[PDB]
């Protein structure tokens, strides 16, 4: 997260860290959607141009962490993955369309003050809040700049950008299963997600019921925090029937 700030404790209790076991490496973010279901970007698990193809036994998740400076004893929790589900129609080759995966946890995590699931958007939250200029919040432990990484979880709030502006900012054939967010060069702030932030949640607090809803998943960009460029995010509501079908099977 570029031009973010340190998260407060318990600020994002849905935050999940995706690790490679050996060599121990923080790969990506993720989010907790129940006691045993975690959402991330599919390219964290499968991206063949980089020879990336992680299986369940290569990986773990850490949940409830604030800082990477130390082990947060009696606070952070850990689980192995039972099963990985990558979207059947994930398009790594052309445009990263449907950059989404689900991860079933071996052992369900106990909720606490530090560990709590985020909501998936309903028809009202998607129709009402997914609008240009409305801000969402991106969290992660990815790179602090394009050209190192934080100890404390970083947070940035970014406005959704109008689709024709998103379209003309990129040479990628963008689809409806993604959106973009970020400040414009003539605007009065900046910030973006960056390397290592994929799978992390783009969340919105509903003014209607005061619940946090996950609207997007950090997915791609042209560098980080460039003027006239925007961060792209997997559109969670568009892929919600997949999410439910996997979880229900």
């Amino acid at each position: 997260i570029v031009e973010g700030s340190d998260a407060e404790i318990g600020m994002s209790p849905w935050q999940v860290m995706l690790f490679r076991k050996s060599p121990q490496e923080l790969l990506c973010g993720a989010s907790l959607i129940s006691d045993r279901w975690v959402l991330t970007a599919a390219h964290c698990l499968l991206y063949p141009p980089w020879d990336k193809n992680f299986t369940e036994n290569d990986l773990l998740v850490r949940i409830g962490k604030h800082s990477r400076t130390r082990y947060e004893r009696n606070i952070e929790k850990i689980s192995m993955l039972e099963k990985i589900y990558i979207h059947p129609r994930y398009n790594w080759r052309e445009n990263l369309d449907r950059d989404i995966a689900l991860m079933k946890l071996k052992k369900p995590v106990a909720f606490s003050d530090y560990i709590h699931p985020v909501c998936l958007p309903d028809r009202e939250t998607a129709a009402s809040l997914l609008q240009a200029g409305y801000k969402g919040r991106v969290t992660g432990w990815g790179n602090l700049k394009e050209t190192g990484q934080p100890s404390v979880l970083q947070v940035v709030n970014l406005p959704i950008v109008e689709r024709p502006v998103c379209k003309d900012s990129t040479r990628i054939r963008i689809t409806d299963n993604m959106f973009c967010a970020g400040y414009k060069p003539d605007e009065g702030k900046r910030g973006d997600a960056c390397e290592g932030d994929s799978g992390g949640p783009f969340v919105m607090k509903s003014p209607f019921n005061n619940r946090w809803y996950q609207m997007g998943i950090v997915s791609w960009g042209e560098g980080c925090d460039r003027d006239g460029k925007y961060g792209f995010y997997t559109h969670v509501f568009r892929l919600k029937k997949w999410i439910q079908k996997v979880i229900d099977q």
Partner: peptide, 10 residues
């Protein structure tokens, strides 16, 4: 390949 458009996956 998305790097042919200057894009890196995150």
């Amino acid at each position: 390949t998305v790097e042919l458009q200057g894009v890196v996956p995150r």
